[PDB]
Description:
Chain A is mainly alpha-helical. Chain A has 2 helices and no strands. Chain A has helices at about 1-5, 15. Chain B has one domain (about 1-30). The interface of A and B includes residues 6, 9, 19 and 20 of A. The PDB classes it as hormone/growth factor.
Amino acid sequence: GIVEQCCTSICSLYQLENYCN
Amino acid sequence: FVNQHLCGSHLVEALYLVCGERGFFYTPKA
């Protein structure tokens, strides 16, 4: 999930936008 | 800003700024 991709590892804009509505 | 380790309120604020009026969903326990 998002915590694995952005918190435990380095986040990116590409990944963050996967969670916008 | 975006390219770093973002956790908790720090991650939530990034989603807020990036998604804008589109909104977003936060699911820690995916």
